[PDB]
Design an enzyme around this catalytic site. Structure first.
Site, PDB file in Angstrom:
ATOM      1  N   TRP A 119      -2.669  63.819  51.579  1.00 18.93           N
ATOM      2  CA  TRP A 119      -4.046  64.092  53.202  1.00 18.93           C
ATOM      3  C   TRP A 119      -4.912  62.537  52.055  1.00 18.93           C
ATOM      4  CZ3 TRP A 119      -1.495  66.699  55.759  1.00 18.93           C
ATOM      5  CH2 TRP A 119      -2.667  67.962  55.733  1.00 18.93           C
ATOM      6  N   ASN A 162      -3.172  64.340  61.255  1.00 16.89           N
ATOM      7  CA  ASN A 162      -2.442  65.942  60.860  1.00 16.89           C
ATOM      8  C   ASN A 162      -2.721  66.944  61.661  1.00 16.89           C
ATOM      9  OD1 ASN A 162      -0.967  67.730  59.243  1.00 16.89           O
ATOM     10  ND2 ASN A 162      -3.626  68.576  59.526  1.00 16.89           N
ATOM     11  N   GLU A 163      -1.633  67.461  62.768  1.00 21.98           N
ATOM     12  CA  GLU A 163      -2.134  68.428  63.573  1.00 21.98           C
ATOM     13  C   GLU A 163      -3.051  68.384  64.762  1.00 21.98           C
ATOM     14  OE1 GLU A 163      -1.695  72.540  61.011  1.00 21.98           O
ATOM     15  OE2 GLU A 163       0.084  72.321  61.127  1.00 21.98           O
ATOM     16  N   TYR A 195       5.242  77.392  62.172  1.00 20.08           N
ATOM     17  CA  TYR A 195       4.238  78.487  61.312  1.00 20.08           C
ATOM     18  C   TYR A 195       3.982  79.583  62.475  1.00 20.08           C
ATOM     19  CZ  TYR A 195       2.340  75.643  57.760  1.00 20.08           C
ATOM     20  OH  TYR A 195       1.970  74.451  56.675  1.00 20.08           O
ATOM     21  N   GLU A 244       5.712  70.064  58.438  1.00 25.70           N
ATOM     22  CA  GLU A 244       5.459  70.845  57.322  1.00 25.70           C
ATOM     23  C   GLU A 244       6.431  72.324  57.896  1.00 25.70           C
ATOM     24  OE1 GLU A 244       1.314  72.046  58.624  1.00 25.70           O
ATOM     25  OE2 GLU A 244       0.866  69.734  57.916  1.00 25.70           O
ATOM     26  N   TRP A 267       5.527  73.721  53.375  1.00 19.40           N
ATOM     27  CA  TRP A 267       4.015  74.273  52.835  1.00 19.40           C
ATOM     28  C   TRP A 267       3.842  75.070  52.000  1.00 19.40           C
ATOM     29  CZ3 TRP A 267      -0.243  70.769  54.125  1.00 19.40           C
ATOM     30  CH2 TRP A 267      -2.129  71.128  53.985  1.00 19.40           C
TER      31      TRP A 267
END
Length: 357
Positions: free
Chosen positions: A37, A161-162, A244, A281, A314
């Site tokens: 980050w 991010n995302e 995920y 990730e 991750w």
């Protein structure tokens, strides 16, 4: 440059000993790239870590009037300098979709909005994101003397991010924002790769359906992300996706195979466009009723054998300190995804597997 990589989120606010332990763990495990980050937005988030990057609009680093605070740019500078010493490359992400470390919602609250997705539309928020990005890209690292713009240890900038925009399921808001901000970064820094940092969601493509019918929202544009249209943006150099299944409504007995199809579908679209792709990730919870190590092996094999460019778990942690230290001396496994450089089957897999590179 195909690679094994990982993620670590605390390289811009922990101690030298903690930062060194993550980077030396990476080097000892053969992990060549670390995704980290590059943001700490909002007063309350900076106060909670005692570390400041973007506490208020137009305020970068530690605000006037606080003694005993850390400057997140000084922490990030240390991480970059240590990574350069060790030969590790970094992918640096510029804002969070999520509230951790402030995120888009922090921007929206600064500017008086009440919806997360105002971050992509409001020209005053867009201005502030550009101002922060220019500040960070042009920052002179106090340990190397080299501006981030000119630093080869940084492999890529990532926009967000995302990234998600559930209020525009046509996909156009995020296509426009990603075109604007990727072109903006290329105008500041012609040296570095730029990617988005999103999870990879598709938007109702013929021939692309979820394994077993589960997590249809990841294939039907629910999040506002049209991965294929983002990948076609000239100022985006490679595709990013995340994985995920346990967060997305997949049943445990389908985690392996749903991730396999997800990986195969992303590689197939990237190959059509002719741009690299990174699974940046992926994770399974330690407590899930599956063989995590054998499923990590399967997903890595699919990325590598089908021509993807990288797979990044991750997440990697090192030694802990203070309240962030478990009985074994490590940063704790707070989310069930932690891997450390120990004798776990996952760590053993990553060390042996990294020798194939």
């Amino acid at each position: 440059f195909r690679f094994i990589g990982s993620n670590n989120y605390y390289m811009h606010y922990k101690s030298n000993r903690m930062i060194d332990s993550v980077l030396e763990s990476a080097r000892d495990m053969g992990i060549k790239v670390l995704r980290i980050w590059g943001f700490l937005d909002g007063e309350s988030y900076c106060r909670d870590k005692n570390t400041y990057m973007h506490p208020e609009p137009g305020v970068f680093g530690v605000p006037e009037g606080i003694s005993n605070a850390q400057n997140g740019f000084e922490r990030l500078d240390y991480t970059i300098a240590k990574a350069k010493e060790l030969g590790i490359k970094l992918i640096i992400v510029l804002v969070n979709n999520w509230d951790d470390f402030g995120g888009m919602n922090q921007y929206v609250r600064w500017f008086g909005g009440t919806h997360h997705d105002d971050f992509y539309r409001d020209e005053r928020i867009k201005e502030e994101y550009k101002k922060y990005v220019s500040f960070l890209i042009n920052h002179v690292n106090v340990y190397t003397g080299v501006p981030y713009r000119e630093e080869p240890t940084i492999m890529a900038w990532e926009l967000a991010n995302e990234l998600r925009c559930e209020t525009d399921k046509s996909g156009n808001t995020l296509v426009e924002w990603v075109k604007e901000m990727s072109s903006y970064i290329k105008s500041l820094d012609p040296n570095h790769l730029v990617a988005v940092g999103d999870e990879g969601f598709f938007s109702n493509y013929e021939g692309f359906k979820p394994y077993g019918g589960e997590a249809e929202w990841a294939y039907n544009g629910w999040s506002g992300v049209d991965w294929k249209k983002l990948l076609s943006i000239e100022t985006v150099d490679f595709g990013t996706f995340h994985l995920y299944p346990s967060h997305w409504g997949v049943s445990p007995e389908n985690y392996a195979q749903w991730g396999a199809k997800w990986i195969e579908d992303h590689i197939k679209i990237a190959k059509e466009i002719g741009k690299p792709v990174v699974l940046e990730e992926y994770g399974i919870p330690k407590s899930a009723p599956v063989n995590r190590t054998a499923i990590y092996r399967l997903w890595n094999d699919l990325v590598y054998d089908l021509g993807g460019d990288g797979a990044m778990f991750w997440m990697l942690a090192g030694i802990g300190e203070g309240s962030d230290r478990d009985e074994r001396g490590y940063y704790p496994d707070y989310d069930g995804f932690r891997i450390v450089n120990d004798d776990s089957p996952e760590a053993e897999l990553i060390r042996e597997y990294a020798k194939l590179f």
